[PDB]
Amino acid sequence: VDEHKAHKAILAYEKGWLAFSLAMLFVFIALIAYTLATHTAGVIPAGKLERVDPTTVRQEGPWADPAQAVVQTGPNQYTVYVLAFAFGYQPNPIEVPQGAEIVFKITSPDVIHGFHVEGTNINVEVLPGEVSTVRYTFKRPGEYRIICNQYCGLGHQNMFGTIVVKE
Amino acid sequence: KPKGALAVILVLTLTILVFWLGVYAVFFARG
Amino acid sequence: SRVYEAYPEKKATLYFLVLGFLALIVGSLFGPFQALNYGNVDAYPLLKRLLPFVQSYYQGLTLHGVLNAIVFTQLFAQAIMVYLPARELNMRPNMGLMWLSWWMAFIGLVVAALPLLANEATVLYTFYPPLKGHWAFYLGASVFVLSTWVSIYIVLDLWRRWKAANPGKVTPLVTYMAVVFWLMWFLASLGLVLEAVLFLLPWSFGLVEGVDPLVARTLFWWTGHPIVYFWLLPAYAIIYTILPKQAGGKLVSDPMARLAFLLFLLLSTPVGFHHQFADPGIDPTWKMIHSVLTLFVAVPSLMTAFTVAASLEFAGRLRGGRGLFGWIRALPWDNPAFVAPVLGLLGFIPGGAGGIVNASFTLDYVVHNTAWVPGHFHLQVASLVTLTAMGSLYWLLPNLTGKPISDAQRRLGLAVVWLWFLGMMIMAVGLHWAGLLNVPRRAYIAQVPDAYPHAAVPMVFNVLAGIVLLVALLLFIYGLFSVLLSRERKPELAEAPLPFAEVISGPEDRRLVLAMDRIGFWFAVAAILVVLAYGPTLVQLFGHLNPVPGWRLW
Numbered sequence: 103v104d105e106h107k108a109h110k111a112i113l114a115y116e117k118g119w120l121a122f123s124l125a126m127l128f129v130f131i132a133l134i135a136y137t138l139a140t141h142t143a144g145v146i147p148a149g150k151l152e153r154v155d156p157t158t159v160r161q162e163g164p165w166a167d168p169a170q171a172v173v174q175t176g177p178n179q180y181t182v183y184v185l186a187f188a189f190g191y192q193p194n195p196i197e198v199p200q201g202a203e204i205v206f207k208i209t210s211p212d213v214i215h216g217f218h219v220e221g222t223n224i225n226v227e228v229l230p231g232e233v234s235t236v237r238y239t240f241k242r243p244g245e246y247r248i249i250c251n252q253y254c255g256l257g258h259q260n261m262f263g264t265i266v267v268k269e
Numbered sequence: 270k271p272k273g274a275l276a277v278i279l280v281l282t283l284t285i286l287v288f289w290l291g292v293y294a295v296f297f298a299r300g
Numbered sequence: 301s302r303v304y305e306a307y308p309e310k311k312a313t314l315y316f317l318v319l320g321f322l323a324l325i326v327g328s329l330f331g332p333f334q335a336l337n338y339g340n341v342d343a344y345p346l347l348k349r350l351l352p353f354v355q356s357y358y359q360g361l362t363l364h365g366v367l368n369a370i371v372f373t374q375l376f377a378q379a380i381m382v383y384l385p386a387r388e389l390n391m392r393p394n395m396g397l398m399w400l401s402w403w404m405a406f407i408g409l410v411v412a413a414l415p416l417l418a419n420e421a422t423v424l425y426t427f428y429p430p431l432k433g434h435w436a437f438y439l440g441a442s443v444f445v446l447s448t449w450v451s452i453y454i455v456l457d458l459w460r461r462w463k464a465a466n467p468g469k470v471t472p473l474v475t476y477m478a479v480v481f482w483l484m485w486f487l488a489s490l491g492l493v494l495e496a497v498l499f500l501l502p503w504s505f506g507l508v509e510g511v512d513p514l515v516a517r518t519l520f521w522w523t524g525h526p527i528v529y530f531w532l533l534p535a536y537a538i539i540y541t542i543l544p545k546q547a548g549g550k551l552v553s554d555p556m557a558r559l560a561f562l563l564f565l566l567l568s569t570p571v572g573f574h575h576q577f578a579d580p581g582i583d584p585t586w587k588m589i590h591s592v593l594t595l596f597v598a599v600p601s602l603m604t605a606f607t608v609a610a611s612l613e614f615a616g617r618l619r620g621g622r623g624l625f626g627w628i629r630a631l632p633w634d635n636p637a638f639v640a641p642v643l644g645l646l647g648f649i650p651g652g653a654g655g656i657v658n659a660s661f662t663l664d665y666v667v668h669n670t671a672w673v674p675g676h677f678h679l680q681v682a683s684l685v686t687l688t689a690m691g692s693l694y695w696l697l698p699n700l701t702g703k704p705i706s707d708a709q710r711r712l713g714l715a716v717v718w719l720w721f722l723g724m725m726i727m728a729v730g731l732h733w734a735g736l737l738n739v740p741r742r743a744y745i746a747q748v749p750d751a752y753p754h755a756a757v758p759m760v761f762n763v764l765a766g767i768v769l770l771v772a773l774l775l776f777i778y779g780l781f782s783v784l785l786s787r788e789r790k791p792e793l794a795e796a797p798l799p800f801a802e803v804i805s806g807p808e809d810r811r812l813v814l815a816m817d818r819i820g821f822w823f824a825v826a827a828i829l830v831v832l833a834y835g836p837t838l839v840q841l842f843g844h845l846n847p848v849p850g851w852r853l854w
């Protein structure tokens with residue numbers, strides 16, 4: 103009869119849909135796991151807690167002198183101590199060589215800011231009291247814009263910075 | 270067979286794949 | 301009415317619904333202005349002449365987020381997920397408690413409204429420290445949300461009275477949905493409650509100098525993922541147990557409906573690190589675990605898509621539709637109560653696709669904190685949930701008040717629902733596309749009109765959405781007040797049964813349905829899953845607190 107047959111077919115095909123759904127989600131998981139084994143994964147923040155005092159970060163330690171923010175830490179590696187604050191970034195510009203691994207260490211003396219480097223996958227929240235650590239290699243020389251993409255107050259829409267990647 | 274429902278989940282599948290693989294491509298282009 | 305003496309829950313339900321629609325209207329006033337802004341048009345001067353208390357774009361966005369996404373949605377959930385189960389069981393909720401929950405919501409709303417309207421809590425609906433709102437914002441929001449604990453109690457009470465009177469019967473479907481929904485929300489709600497009691501309230505009151513921003517956010521998003529499922533599941537309750545009847549059909553599977561809700565109970569809460577992919581100090585392995593669990597929580601909506609689509613198809617075939625598209629044409633497109641959720645569900649297709657991208661850990665770095673994110677969620681909550689609530693004006697309000705819907709009000713409702721749907725689709729194109737061009741969310745970008753030249757095309761979409769949704773909203777306001785403040789009353793509308801669907805004929809059930817009805821057991825499982833997903837990170841953060849001072853940068 104009508105309803106019983108419709109019911110039976112509906113359920114059989116639904117189970118097929120669900121198995122298929124699952125397969126496709128599992129393939130996404132495999133494709134995500136691939137990203138995690140590549141250099142593209144550098145932009146994931148370090149999970150290690152690295153606490154600082156937002157009230158002295160402009161007076162003492164590696165964020166206190168932005169002209170010394172860029173430090174060579176290996177043969178082809180540079181560490182950059184970045185301050186995100188209301189409403190800008192220091193140093194400005196950040197100047198690095200292309201082809202080198204750049205380790206960004208970013209904190210804030212005030213509120214939460216974003217650090218979104220347009221044209222790249224660098225997109226990290228910056229918490230007062232915490233160091234956000236992310237890694238990236240700029241393959242193309244030139245000027246990249248930093249956008250703050252976390253609401254930080256009335257100056258949010260004009261909070262930009264600059265990275266200069268030297269040939 | 271529930272042909273209408275299958276068409277809906279075909280559109281849903283296509284949408285999901287276009288979205289996901291599109292952004293996957295953007296992710297690697299920006300890597 | 302003697303209707304209200306016999307069914308006093310009708311009046312309380314009405315009060316939740318109207319209060320929610322009022323919040324919807326006020327928060328939504330800001331929407332068109334925000335859409336124009338993402339279209340690079342600054343119309344805030346006009347708004348501040350109309351509403352002189354508005355000091356900024358960001359005060360507006362705070363009101364928008366809080367009133368639409370927190371307030372309206374909760375009130376709708378409290379209406380639907382108390383009243384539908386009560387009517388299915390034909391039992392009265394504890395009326396003292398039901399009125400307590402309304403007054404708690406009302407008072408909390410008023411208390412939170414005061415700082416918001418006075419420009420003392422322009423911190424957005426996420427209120428991330430160390431941005432520091434006025435204490436009345438956090439206290440009022442706290443009492444508002446805690447209203448729901450009374451709702452949970454009320455529905456567990458109804459369920460237990462019913463099982464006492466009916467031992468050896470399985471929980472009826474709508475009541476099953478509501479019980480697991482409210483239990484899910486209990487577990488879910490604990491994050492924010494902890495955040496408020498341990499951190500935000502003592503801080504806002506002066507009792508501590510600082511708050512640790514990472515621990516605040518982690519506790520926030522414990523609640524912050526499942527709160528969207530809390531928004532969604534009332535609309536699913538309608539879509540599963542009422543819409544099939546309005547379509548002309550039947551629900552095609554009771555057990556598949558139960559299973560979707562049970563998976564929501566198990567998987568809604570342990571996933572919140574998918575809002576913290578860009579956060580320092582959370583382990584990447586935990587991020588990947590939460591990503592995987594987030595893709596699993598997609599499954600119940602993948603299932604819903606088929607169960608619901610198949611029910612609509614069945615409905616359209618019953619009404620004579622034949623071929624692969626004829627079943628669509630055959631449905632009751634003349635009925636706004638039918639149309640509103642069906643259009644919601646269409647936008648849920650790109651909406652859910654956007655969610656799955658967001659869930660995929662590394663892919664989140666493409667879209668995080670861009671206009672993509674509001675593009676996603678307007679399809680989910682500002683379209684499907686909202687449209688389902690708007691549909692309820694055309695069946696639920698008459699059932700609660702006896703006020704009839706004229707032919708003219710029905711047609712107007714069709715127009716509102718279509719323009720709202722079309723507006724949201726258009727804006728979703730504008731926001732997803734600007735998002736992919738790196739335009740930030742939560743930004744007064746029309747005040748930096750040369751900052752995003754490449755987004756010129758999507759920006760046109762945003763302007764157009766802005767004006768379409770302003771028309772939709774004005775029409776919605778006119779329609780709502782037309783129906784409420786109507787002359788006529790026909791009490792037989794308030795006395796009619798709710799249009800609950802029948803379930804299609806066919807066996808297969810009983811064993812799966814019995815296992816799913818072990819609600820105490822599944823509740824314990826859900827909580828265990830939360831302890832495993834959150835406990836290790838939270839143990840670590842709590843042993844390494846780093847409180848920092850508060851700022852007001854507005």
Ligand code: HAS
Nearest residue numbers: 528574601605609645648652655656658659668677680681
């Ligand atoms: C109601 C409200 C919401 C729902 C539902 C929702 C669903 C998802 N979301 Fe989301 N979302 C995220 C992932 C997901 C995933 C995996 C799902 C899934 O649950 C979705 C599964 C859905 C589907 C698989 C679609 C099934 C399709 C159906 C059921 C329709 C079928 C059509 C029919 C039957 C019609 C047929 C009829 C005919 C006539 C043909 C992530 C990350 O993983 C973020 C953070 C991103 C970031 O960087 O900030 C996020 C951000 C948000 C925010 C912003 C928070 C903030 O303010 O920062 C909100 C408000 C929100 C709401 C909602 N979201 N989301």
Ligand code: HEM
Nearest residue numbers: 331332334335365368369424425674681682741742743769
């Ligand atoms: C006329 C209707 C609407 C329009 C035109 C609209 C427009 C917008 C726009 C353009 C934004 C982005 C602002 C930004 O990122 O700076 C936004 C944010 C938002 N909207 Fe809507 N909106 C509408 C209705 C709704 C509804 C009904 C809800 C919920 C049910 C909702 C919830 C939100 C939320 C939660 C945000 C995010 C606030 C935040 O980031 O703090 N909207 N809306």
Ligand SMILES: CCCCCCCC/C=C\CCCCCCCC(=O)OC[C@H](O)CO
Nearest residue numbers: 129130132133136137140141142293297300
């Ligand atoms: C019945 C069928 C059963 C079998 C079905 C299997 C599904 C295959 C799908 C995807 C595999 C993922 C491929 C993994 C490699 C991806 C490489 C990649 O994406 O490379 C881009 C980038 O340029 C480099 O860094």
Ligand code: CUA
Nearest residue numbers: 215250252254
């Ligand atoms: Cu800094 Cu927004």
Ligand SMILES: [Cl-]
Nearest residue numbers: 524525528655
């Ligand atoms: Cl979400």
Ligand SMILES: [Cl-]
Nearest residue numbers: 532598601652
């Ligand atoms: Cl969902």
Ligand SMILES: [Cu+2]
Nearest residue numbers: 524525574575
């Ligand atoms: Cu979420």
